[PDB]
Amino acid sequence: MNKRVKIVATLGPAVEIRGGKKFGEDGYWGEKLDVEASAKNIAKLIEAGANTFRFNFSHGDHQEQGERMATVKLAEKIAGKKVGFLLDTKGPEIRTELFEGEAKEYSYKTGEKIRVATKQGIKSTREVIALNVAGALDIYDDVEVGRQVLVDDGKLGLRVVAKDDATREFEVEVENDGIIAKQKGVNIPNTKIPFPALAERDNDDIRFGLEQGINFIAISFVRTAKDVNEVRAICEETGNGHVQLFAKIENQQGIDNLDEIIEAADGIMIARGDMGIEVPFEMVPVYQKMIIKKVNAAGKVVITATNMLETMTEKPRATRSEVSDVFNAVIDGTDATMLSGESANGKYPLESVTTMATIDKNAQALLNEYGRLDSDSFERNSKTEVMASAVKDATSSMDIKLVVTLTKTGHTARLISKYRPNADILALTFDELTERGLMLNWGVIPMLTDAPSSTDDMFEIAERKAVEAGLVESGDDIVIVAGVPVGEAVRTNTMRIRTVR
Amino acid sequence: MNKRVKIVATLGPAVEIRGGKKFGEDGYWGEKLDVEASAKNIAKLIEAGANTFRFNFSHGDHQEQGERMATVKLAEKIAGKKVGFLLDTKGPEIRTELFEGEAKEYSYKTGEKIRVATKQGIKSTREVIALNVAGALDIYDDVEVGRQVLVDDGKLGLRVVAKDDATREFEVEVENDGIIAKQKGVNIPNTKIPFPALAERDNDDIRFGLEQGINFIAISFVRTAKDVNEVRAICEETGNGHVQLFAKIENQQGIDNLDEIIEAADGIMIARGDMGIEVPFEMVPVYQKMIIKKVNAAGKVVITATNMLETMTEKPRATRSEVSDVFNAVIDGTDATMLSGESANGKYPLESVTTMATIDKNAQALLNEYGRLDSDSFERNSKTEVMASAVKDATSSMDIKLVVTLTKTGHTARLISKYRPNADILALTFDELTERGLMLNWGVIPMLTDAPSSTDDMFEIAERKAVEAGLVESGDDIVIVAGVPVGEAVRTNTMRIRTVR
Amino acid sequence: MNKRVKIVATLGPAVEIRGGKKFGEDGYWGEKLDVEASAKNIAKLIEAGANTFRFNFSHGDHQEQGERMATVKLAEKIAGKKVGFLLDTKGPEIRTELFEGEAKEYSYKTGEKIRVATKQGIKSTREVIALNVAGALDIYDDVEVGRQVLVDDGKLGLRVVAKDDATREFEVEVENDGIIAKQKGVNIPNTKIPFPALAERDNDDIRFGLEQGINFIAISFVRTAKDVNEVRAICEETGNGHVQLFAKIENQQGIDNLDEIIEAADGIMIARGDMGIEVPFEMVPVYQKMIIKKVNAAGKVVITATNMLETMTEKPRATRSEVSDVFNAVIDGTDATMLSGESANGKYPLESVTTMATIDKNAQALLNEYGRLDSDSFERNSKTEVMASAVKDATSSMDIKLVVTLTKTGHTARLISKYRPNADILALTFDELTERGLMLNWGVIPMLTDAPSSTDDMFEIAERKAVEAGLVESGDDIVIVAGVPVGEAVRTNTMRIRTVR
Amino acid sequence: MNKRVKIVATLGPAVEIRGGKKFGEDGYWGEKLDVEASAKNIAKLIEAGANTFRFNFSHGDHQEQGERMATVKLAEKIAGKKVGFLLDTKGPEIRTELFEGEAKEYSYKTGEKIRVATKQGIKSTREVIALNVAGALDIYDDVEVGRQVLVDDGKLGLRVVAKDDATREFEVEVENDGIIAKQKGVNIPNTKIPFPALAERDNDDIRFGLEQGINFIAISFVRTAKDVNEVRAICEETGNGHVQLFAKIENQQGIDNLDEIIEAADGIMIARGDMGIEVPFEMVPVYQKMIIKKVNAAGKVVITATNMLETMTEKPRATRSEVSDVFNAVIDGTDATMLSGESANGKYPLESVTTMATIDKNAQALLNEYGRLDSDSFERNSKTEVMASAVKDATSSMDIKLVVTLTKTGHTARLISKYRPNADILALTFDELTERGLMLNWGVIPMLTDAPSSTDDMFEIAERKAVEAGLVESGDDIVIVAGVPVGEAVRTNTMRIRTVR
Ligand SMILES: O=P(O)(O)OC[C@H]1O[C@](O)(COP(=O)(O)O)[C@@H](O)[C@@H]1O
Ligand SMILES: O=P(O)(O)OC[C@H]1O[C@](O)(COP(=O)(O)O)[C@@H](O)[C@@H]1O
Ligand SMILES: [K+]
Ligand SMILES: [K+]
Ligand SMILES: [Mg+2]
Ligand SMILES: [Mg+2]
């Protein structure tokens, strides 16, 4: 059986050999990057079923992200399998400042009255916590009494009980025992801090990514369609119109504007890390199931992200809760599941990919029984979608090992994928931009082929490439879909059921 | 908008012209049969929607039947449209004898005690009714006390109160007021009277029919699968393997043996006349729905028969219950509705066909909302059946004016029909046996075409035959199914969605 | 066991003996009504399953209708069973006049040109048909060129091809061969002849009927809510607020206003006779199913009317199409089936009721498998309604022989009836108006009892009434519903499942 | 918003105070158990939503288990709220022995060849790992070449490559890098070590548990119905027939015998820790959903256990994974969710219970929209069950705040619970065994009350207990169910819908 749900793996030092040293040994950050040895490691993640690599520009400067992307291009040749290239923007960040006298952190206790300063370019004291806000924005006027300020992935919460106009300081009450360390992520849920739709840092990060060559951008903290439209404009300008934009939904505002965001984007990344701090943590599974249904209904890509195999960062086995989360994300109808720290900076990047692949492959076999998505409810809004519906029906009527589509732009493949047939989908395309562009769509196995000439038998070509890929053997039944004849046919218009000889 | 539900019309004097006179006109029986004028009159039934003519061998001799069949063959050429040919057998029958003294009938009152004689060759008296039993069988040992003897379309009931061994007479009580006339039909419900599986006279009737050229045999009072298999043996013996056998379910035994009768036959005629006398009348609607569903699930033809527009025998307008009966037969899922005395012996044969066609045409538009058949429940047991399922799916996703199948034996057109698509089925076939064999399948418009050569584009032929037939025009979307390419393809294996040029 | 679908039987001269004479005999109408022999005939229809008698004010004067009502009152005492009393208005009928020269009828041929007169109080000639318009209305201005005048149950069509202002005659073309006889019903479909919302003669007939004692009024040709509201005002102002109104839907305007008619009425009579003339005959089965669903969703009574066993007017047995019609009306979800000429004028009134009761009883056993009504879909809009839903659930979960409700006004009985439980409904009420008012609700067996004391065990009273009615025996499981306790309870608020001692 | 999903919290040192020190603090184990301060910690778990305490007989002697049970009996009096008492057996555990020279652990690399001894009562060396097998059983004959020995929650794999018959030692190959620490769990999947159906240690522990007073026994590693029936015999033999048995399904054999184990047991604990080691980890979510469905269909209790908020052992926040796992367990249909190490040995026992209670409470609001259980499919096999079905129908038809049942044994409450009504269930019972007996049934709020007299209004009692309990206010709608009248009723036979005054 082939794996239909796609894997995004984040790259970091965990895979990268430096002068024979594995990550986090004595001296490691001294030695020179070992490019062949690293690439051999990354080629193992590809063979274990990583379909796209995520380059997280929250961490590591341009040269490091340049070097990692080039190491991946090497690994593609060692594996003999191509992968997608996804850039993840930094976006708006609030961090806690340095402390007076280079103190790393302080410990607080429930009931404690302290203050949070809004003045920029100062240091924190134990008593007065200062913020490093992207663009040095003043946030005093943006947050009201009763709002919460949450420090370090939401581990410590401060309730704003009052506002001091003379100092521009929040009077806060500590809500639980915990630590405030320096240069730690701060969230302020249910506030509209006027960060730009697209910051200048993220503009430059994107333009460099587009230069090196990428297939996808995931845009952090998308709040309105404007955040997506402005990234789109740049993709257009530089002739990178092939690039697909996933909005990262991370906060209440993003969730409020989700319908317009989906309309503007090619896909949604469900960024549960932030979203779980920014909205009631118990609501995240509600939003997860709703988002997946709405994006699938739009024929777009949905990625479920963050903590999927979290304990595998430090321990060799996933917990029962983590296997359950990966399985249920498949059953909910996700196109893709993602690894962050587990692949980027953990002790078990390869085992983490193998584990997610094993769960994902198992879960796809339960989609008939338990799948939340319902393709019978969709309006078939074009003739290609009608063909996709009929392909679904054939794969429901009898045992179809494979669907094969000859697809110029990938449109047929995306509509077949949308209907979630009980078969793998071989997308035969004629250019690498379409090929890589398809690597996160559920079920789709993109494969490069010569454009069929008017004398070619498209059906013989489809059967032959399917046998070449080892996907089917003698006696297997396959469905082939194509625009027949080539030149005359305006769209996919023909379906054949073919016994493989 | 074409009529999907097929009409069977029974031929008789009502459509024959004698010396420029219609049936019922003064002098009619004193004029000679006008063959051409009759053929032109029958041509009007073809144009109005008759798809098959029934030749009832219960009435008239071989000479009369043979000449009716020859006159329909003329009518086909005048209308420019072919129809099926159906022989309906005499089968097991009991009639009241002639009365001593050339008396016509007597009248009887409830509770009156009389006798029914079983001795063959005798005349009836007022107090002693003699039976003409088919093949002069002695029925005395096969009817128990408490059984009922019903005379003339079930109008008069006689309870068997005792058996007189010396006279071989039944002592009977008159259960209701009514008349006994000579040569009227007698039923004895829930007896196993040992009429042969195939009587000699039905053997000879079927041979005569097979010599004339027929597409269908309706076997009267099928009691077991043996009744069907013995007719099949003659069809096989004579090289008439193409002839489809419809079992007429008319009594309790046929209903007990329904599953084995359906397996052995090509279809069922729901013969409601005898059925509603031979089982409790109020159960006939139950048996009708059940049979339609079982036959449809087997991919076979079901004909709903008898009294559907009964009043139009004598009146120009159908009753409200008659329009309701024809409508509800369509919703039940009937392939065909039948006219008996309405077309054969009535004053308004053309109006009867037209009325039936108008009802059938309107009821077909309500099969989506009210239809009792459920194609989603069927096992697709072959590749031609999964193609039929996918055509049904395409006709549910978008407006398809027509499904075109190129079919060698009609097998693809039978399976498309079974799934009751939201479109007309144009069955392009290569011989006239196949063509006329399809004329009672729901939705199917059979049409003769030259066998395509491996040079011929079947999708162009399909489109051109449909434009030439008047069925589609520019802008209409059609589904085309075929075994591509001719030579290699072992079955129907391809579907195209095509906008007609 | 008990017949849940109600029968309305039309009373006419078929059951009425007058000075030893029967309908058709010379001097019949001059002889005095033999009230006792007539009541014994009617008592037989009551025993055979008639639940309500219809008095058709289209035929016979006030005295005739008055004597016929008094004879049913006597028949109730002979049968020992009460029935409802339904008055059916004449309404805006048009009829062909008497001819000159005492002529009964004339023959006409397709293409013949004749005239229809609009002038009132004159006589038809062969060439000039005169119309007897209800209220002597002048229709000349309300029927345009291109309309159709239909004579005699829709049997002869006349196309208005011109209008002569000098004589105020329609110039018509005979559309088909047939007969214009005297006093035959005329319809002019798709016209708004401005007959008043309530004519003086219908006003007078209703008032006469209210004075005699009636439960129901069926209002002929309801076009708007106004037609119902005008009869409502009269029932209310005379102290007859208990009288229930059934709108007869007989024409296109009635169908166009169906939803506000149902709101304003207590029920609908599906008057198929005129409806099948006034709209395309093939649409009637469509409107019947839709009407029955809508009326049942409002908790109101639907009567399926006209031609149900038509041929039993003249012949001893129903056709197979007639049995199918009554069976399919039950499965559609009708509360009540109706007889007109079959019971009012025919040769076989007792046998027609018996036949209809046998069909209804059988058909009820198939409502769980085939029944078109879906109670699971309704909004439960009150707590009496949620209790009726819970009763329906108990009768679905186990074998419940009987549902008993103690109901002051019949509201709880109506709502249980709406949900169509798999059980008979014993409605114990405390006055005869309510008791007779429940006689047409599906499943309801109404029965008189004293208003229970706040002393009384209502669940014991219910069991005892059920044993006294012969409905249950020792071992049977019954559902009892009541407002507990009396005085404190504002509504039905209790359900008990009890095993009969 | 009452929490309908029940919480099982495992007791351990995490909640125990010893001379003013919390668990983990310097010198903790030196100080003595402070019973009052421990009981006050435990009362806070009770207030936050813990419904039953698990006493895990895998860890601590009888003296420690007994003290802990007495402390919870104090906590119930401080909380003002009763809780269930669940004993969890040791069962057939294997552990790594102590090392020679008191060495704590050793590290191994992939491909190392070592030995595992079967000899009982000796210490391990690096090269020869010794096993503490439950009951000192010799496992040498039970594990074949090619089997896997896994150490410490499945973290390190040892493949058996050969067996030395002389020393009765396994030759094993290290399959992955990791640690063998002393006294860690060992698993040998897909073997059948002949552990007795009931080991003497588990017999003794259960008998100690029954003498102290328990409501529930969770039987570890149930392989067959016989493992349950042996504990059942002890419960009955000792007067403890009320005690409920949960089979823990933890290996392949229990899964293979699931249907038989469910028949013999009162419920299932889905013991995902051992299950995910003993069967393919990716299959665990499959078995979970299936178990929940079958157990619910049986009207029994299902507890979903292990790793549910794992990270909250060491960190203040749950991962997105863990929230997703608890939420999906609720949607699957679990009666109860469990905390093990998170409540027994973690830093945040209270915040763990609080967190789970928040997820569980939010998830129940979505069971209507997303719930996998379907009560419509159940056969109602008894009159109580039909009453449960009607209750469910009323809670779906309108807004019912509370279902009240007066239940002597808890049968009516268990069946109402089984049907998952959209309301809390107040179970008023008359003894403490039934009260505590019901604390793991979904939705059930057990409450001790006086047995109603012959004179009492049970519907007044129901309303009044519900108001006193703070569960309903004026104008709320409730559903009350009872066997009325008291002393006459043989079962629940009455449902009332009452507005709180
Ligand atoms: O797919 P199925 O049901 O096995 O049927 C395949 C058979 O039908 C046929 O295709 C006949 O089909 P048509 O008569 O429709 O052309 C045969 O060639 C073949 O043997
Ligand atoms: O529950 P609903 O639909 O509000 O109806 C309540 C009304 O029904 C009644 O209970 C009448 O019911 P019955 O006639 O069935 O006893 C009135 O007392 C009350 O006003
Ligand atoms: K015949
Ligand atoms: K009338
Ligand atoms: Mg017959
Ligand atoms: Mg365990």
3-state secondary structure labels for all residues of A322-367: HHHHHHHHHHHCCCEEEECHHHHCCCCHHHHHHHHHHHHHHHHCCH
Inside any domain, residue B182: yes
Domain's final residue, options B141, B163, B187: B187
Half-sphere exposure of A417 toward its Cβ, with a 13 Å CA cutoff?
Answer: 31
Residue ranges of the annotated binding site of B for phosphoenolpyruvate are 54, 248, 273-274, 306
Inside any domain, residue A1: no
CB C495 to CB D385 under 8 A? no
In terms of phi and psi (left: phi > 0; alpha: psi -120 to 50; beta: otherwise), the region of C207 is alpha
How many whole angstroms separate alpha carbon B115 and alpha carbon B96?
A: 12
How many whole angstroms separate alpha carbon A286 and alpha carbon D366?
A: 8
C39 in the same domain as C112: no
The finding on whether C207 has its CB within 6 A of some atom of ligand 2 is no
How many whole angstroms separate alpha carbon A392 and alpha carbon A278?
A: 38
- Among protein residues, the one with the nearest Cα to ligand 2's atom 16 is C407
What does B253-318 look like in DSSP terms, one character per residue?
HHHHTHHHHHHHSSEEEEEHHHHHHHS-GGGHHHHHHHHHHHHHHTT-EEEEESSTTGGGGTSSS-
Structure tokens at B375: 């194609």
CA dihedral C366, C372, C376, C380 (to 10 degrees): -120
Give me the CATH number covering residue A310. 3.20.20.60
Domain's final residue, options A339, A366, A393: A366
* Under 8 Å between Cβ of B94 and B186: yes
From the alpha carbon of C381, which atom of ligand 2 is closest? 3
D487 in the same domain as D431: yes
Catalytic residue selected from A95, A123, A147, A496:
A95
| Beta strands B94-96; B33-34: pairing state | unpaired
Instruction: Kindly list the distances between the CA atom of residue B42 and the CA atoms of B7, B353, C168, D123, in Å, as whole numbers in the listed order.
Output: 14, 11, 43, 105
Inside any domain, residue A79: yes
C467 in the same domain as C326: no
CA dihedral C468, C471, C474, C480 (to 10 degrees): -90
**Cβ-based contacts of C374 with chain B (< 8 Å):** none
First to last CA, chain D: 21
* Under 8 Å between Cβ of C117 and C131: yes
How many whole angstroms separate alpha carbon C48 and alpha carbon A441?
A: 69
CB C282 to CB B322 under 8 A? no
**Residue whose C-alpha is closest to residue B193's, from B130, B136, B257:** B136
What does C46-107 look like in DSSP terms, one character per residue?
HHTTEEEEEEETTSS-HHHHHHHHHHHHHHHHHHT---EEEEE---S-EEE-PBSTT--EEE
- Check residue A313 and report its DSSP letter: G
CB C155 to CB B317 under 8 A? yes
- Check residue B185 and report its DSSP letter: B
**Cβ-based contacts of A398 with chain B (< 8 Å):** 380, 383, 386
CA C490 to ligand 2 center in whole angstroms: 7
How many whole angstroms separate alpha carbon A13 and alpha carbon A16?
A: 5
Instruction: Name residue, tokens 């698990």.
Output: D54
Distance of alpha carbon B74 from the chain centroid: 22
User: Is position A168 annotated as part of the catalytic site?
Assistant: no
| Beta strands D94-96; D131-133: pairing state | antiparallel
D125 in the same domain as D69: no
- B477 membership: H or E segment, kind and range: strand B477-482
From B384, B385, B434, mutation site for ligand 1 pocket: most ligand atoms within 8 A of C-beta: B384
D399 in the same domain as D353: no
- Among protein residues, the one with the nearest Cα to ligand 2's atom 9 is C491
A356 in the same domain as A494: no
For the four alpha carbons of B412, B417, B418 and B423, in that order, the dihedral sign comes to positive
D64 is in an annotated binding site: yes
Resolution (angstroms) equals 2.0
* Under 8 Å between Cβ of C290 and C332: no
| D162 burial type by CB count under 10 A (0-12 exposed, 13-18 middle, 19+ buried) | exposed
How many whole angstroms separate alpha carbon D117 and alpha carbon D114?
A: 10
What number of other Cβ atoms are within 10 A of residue C382's Cβ? Answer: 14
How many whole angstroms separate alpha carbon C444 and alpha carbon C459?
A: 18
Residues facing C445 on adjacent strands? C426
C174 in the same domain as C127: yes
How many whole angstroms separate alpha carbon B382 and alpha carbon B401?
A: 26
How many whole angstroms separate alpha carbon A402 and alpha carbon C183?
A: 75
Omega of the bond leading into A13 within 30 degrees of 0 (cis): no
From C409, C416, C425, mutation site for ligand 2 pocket: most ligand atoms within 8 A of C-beta: C409
- B67 membership: H or E segment, kind and range: helix B62-79
Here the contacts of C18-23 (C-beta below 8 Å, separation 24 or greater) are C23/C345
Instruction: Name residue, tokens 């929490």.
Output: D3
Instruction: Kindly list the distances between the CA atom of residue D389 and the CA atoms of A178, D72, D458, in Å, as whole numbers in the listed order.
Output: 49, 37, 21
A331 in the same domain as A214: yes
Ligand found nearest the CA of C344:
4
**Residue whose C-alpha is closest to residue B17's, from B74, B55, B58, B56:** B74
Half-sphere exposure of C127 toward its Cβ, with a 13 Å CA cutoff?
Answer: 0
From the alpha carbon of B381, which atom of ligand 1 is closest? 3
Residue ranges of the annotated binding site of B for Mg(2+) are 250, 274
Inside any domain, residue D483: yes
> Which residues have C-beta within 8 Å of that of residue B276, sequence separation ≥ 6?
B154, B284, C320, C323
Q: What are the start-end ranges of the E strands in C105-194?
A: 105-108, 113-117, 128-133, 148-151, 156-164, 169-174, 178-181, 185-187
CB D398 to CB C390 under 8 A? no
Interface of D with C in 198-227 (CB under 8 A): none
* Under 8 Å between Cβ of A38 and A17: yes
> Which residues have C-beta within 8 Å of that of residue C155, sequence separation ≥ 6?
B315, B316, B317, C178, C179
Residues facing A497 on adjacent strands? A479
Structure tokens at A361: 């492959």
Interface of D with A in 301-340 (CB under 8 A): 306-311, 315-329
Instruction: Kindly list the distances between the CA atom of residue B375 and the CA atoms of B267, B285, C252, in Å, as whole numbers in the listed order.
Output: 18, 22, 35
From the alpha carbon of C383, which atom of ligand 2 is closest? 1
* Under 8 Å between Cβ of D155 and D178: yes
Range of the domain at A107: 94-187
How many whole angstroms separate alpha carbon A82 and alpha carbon A438?
A: 11
Give me the CATH number covering residue C116. 2.40.33.10
* Under 8 Å between Cβ of C36 and C21: no
How many whole angstroms separate alpha carbon B193 and alpha carbon B180?
A: 22
Q: Strand, coil or helix: what is D248?
A: strand
Residue ranges of the annotated binding site of A for beta-D-fructose 1,6-bisphosphate are 382, 384, 407-412, 490-491
Distance of alpha carbon C161 from the chain centroid: 37
**Residue whose C-alpha is closest to residue D196's, from D238, D226, D232, D234:** D226
Structure tokens at B177: 């007021």
Structure tokens at B368: 């989506």
Q: Strand, coil or helix: what is D316?
A: coil
How many whole angstroms separate alpha carbon D18 and alpha carbon B71?
A: 111
Inside any domain, residue C174: yes
> Which residues have C-beta within 8 Å of that of residue A214, sequence separation ≥ 6?
A55, A69, A85, A86, A87, A240, A243
- A19 membership: H or E segment, kind and range: none
> Which residues have C-beta within 8 Å of that of residue C478, sequence separation ≥ 6?
C400, C401, C402, C403, C404, C462, C463, C466, C472, C497, C498, C500
Half-sphere exposure of C166 toward its Cβ, with a 13 Å CA cutoff?
Answer: 2
* Under 8 Å between Cβ of C477 and C401: yes
Half-sphere exposure of B209 toward its Cβ, with a 13 Å CA cutoff?
Answer: 29
How many whole angstroms separate alpha carbon B52 and alpha carbon B11?
A: 10
The finding on whether C417 has its CB within 6 A of some atom of ligand 2 is no
- Check residue A33 and report its DSSP letter: B
* Under 8 Å between Cβ of B486 and B430: no
Half-sphere exposure of A373 toward its Cβ, with a 13 Å CA cutoff?
Answer: 30
**Residue whose C-alpha is closest to residue D404's, from D429, D441, D380:** D429
C26 in the same domain as C104: no
How many whole angstroms separate alpha carbon A470 and alpha carbon A224?
A: 44
Distance of alpha carbon D281 from the chain centroid: 20
Instruction: Name residue, tokens 């012996």.
Output: B345
What does A236-250 look like in DSSP terms, one character per residue?
HHTT-TT-EEEEEE-
Q: Which of C275, C288, C314, C320 to mutate against chain B (most B CBs within 10 Å)? A: C320
| B229 burial type by CB count under 10 A (0-12 exposed, 13-18 middle, 19+ buried) | middle
D354 in the same domain as D237: yes
Q: Strand, coil or helix: what is C489?
A: coil
Task: Return the biggest CA–CA distance within chain B.
Answer: 82
How many whole angstroms separate alpha carbon D428 and alpha carbon D405?
A: 6
How many whole angstroms separate alpha carbon B127 and alpha carbon B106?
A: 10
Q: What are the start-end ranges of the E strands in C285-335?
A: 301-305
Q: Which of D282, D284, D304 to mutate against chain A (most A CBs within 10 Å)? A: D282
Q: What are the start-end ranges of the E strands in B20-104?
A: 33-34, 50-56, 84-88, 94-96
First to last CA, chain A: 20
| C141 burial type by CB count under 10 A (0-12 exposed, 13-18 middle, 19+ buried) | exposed
* Under 8 Å between Cβ of A38 and A69: no
D184 is in an annotated binding site: yes
Neighbours of ion ligand 3 (CB under 5 A): B 56, 58, 88, 220
Omega of the bond leading into C446 within 30 degrees of 0 (cis): no
How many whole angstroms separate alpha carbon A292 and alpha carbon A269?
A: 10
From the alpha carbon of C409, which atom of ligand 2 is closest? 14
Q: How many domains does chain A have?
A: 3
Q: Which strand ranges, in their side-by-side order, compose the sheet holding B186-187?
A: B94-96, B128-133, B113-117, B169-174, B156-164, B148-151, B186-187
State residue A310 phi and psi, 5-degree precision: -50, -50
Instruction: Kindly list the distances between the CA atom of residue C39 and the CA atoms of C80, C87, C209, in Å, as whole numbers in the listed order.
Output: 12, 19, 19
Distance of alpha carbon D218 from the chain centroid: 7
> Which residues have C-beta within 8 Å of that of residue C30, sequence separation ≥ 6?
none
Helices B411-418, B383-397: axis angle to 10 degrees equals: 50
CB A394 to CB B385 under 8 A? no
Q: Strand, coil or helix: what is A267?
A: strand
Question: In chain B, after which residues is the C-to-N distance over 2.5 Å, breaking the chain?
Answer: none
CA dihedral A245, A250, A253, A258 (to 10 degrees): 50
Structure tokens at A223: 């709040």
A129 in the same domain as A103: yes
Domain's final residue, options C334, C361, C388: C361
If DSSP states are collapsed to H, E and C, what string results for A158-207?
EEEEEEECCCCEEEEEECCCEEEECCCEEECCCCCCCCCCCCHHHHHHHH
State residue C339 phi and psi, 5-degree precision: -115, 135
Instruction: Kindly list the distances between the CA atom of residue D434 and the CA atoms of B495, D5, D84, D265, D438, in Å, as whole numbers in the listed order.
Output: 66, 19, 10, 17, 6
- Check residue A466 and report its DSSP letter: H
Inside any domain, residue D83: yes
* Under 8 Å between Cβ of B163 and B140: yes
Inside any domain, residue B176: yes
How many whole angstroms separate alpha carbon D219 and alpha carbon C186?
A: 85
How many whole angstroms separate alpha carbon A69 and alpha carbon A51?
A: 14
How many whole angstroms separate alpha carbon B481 and alpha carbon B493?
A: 7
Instruction: Kindly list the distances between the CA atom of residue A275 and the CA atoms of A58, A272, C326, in Å, as whole numbers in the listed order.
Output: 17, 5, 62
How many whole angstroms separate alpha carbon D441 and alpha carbon D335?
A: 6
Instruction: Kindly list the distances between the CA atom of residue C34 and the CA atoms of A6, B488, C18, C74, C76, in Å, as whole numbers in the listed order.
Output: 91, 87, 5, 12, 16
Residues facing C61 on adjacent strands? none
State residue C78 phi and psi, 5-degree precision: -75, -40
Structure tokens at A155: 């581990």
**Residue whose C-alpha is closest to residue C287's, from C267, C264, C268, C265:** C268
A453-480 burial, b at 16+ Cβ within 10 Å, e below that, comes to: eeeeebbebbbebbbeeebbeeebbbbb
Facing residue for A393 by CB, picked from B390, B493, B497: B390
How many whole angstroms separate alpha carbon D239 and alpha carbon B411?
A: 72
What number of other Cβ atoms are within 10 A of residue D450's Cβ? Answer: 9
Method of structure determination: X-ray
D278 in the same domain as D228: yes
Half-sphere exposure of C161 toward its Cβ, with a 13 Å CA cutoff?
Answer: 13
How many whole angstroms separate alpha carbon B59 and alpha carbon B56?
A: 6
Inside any domain, residue D350: yes
Structure tokens at B23: 């049936």
Helices D200-212, D62-79: axis angle to 10 degrees equals: 30
Structure tokens at D371: 């719930």
| C230 burial type by CB count under 10 A (0-12 exposed, 13-18 middle, 19+ buried) | middle
Instruction: Name residue, tokens 């779906």.
Output: D396
State residue A229 phi and psi, 5-degree precision: -60, -40
Structure tokens at A84: 């997608």
Give me the CATH number covering residue A413. 3.40.1380.20
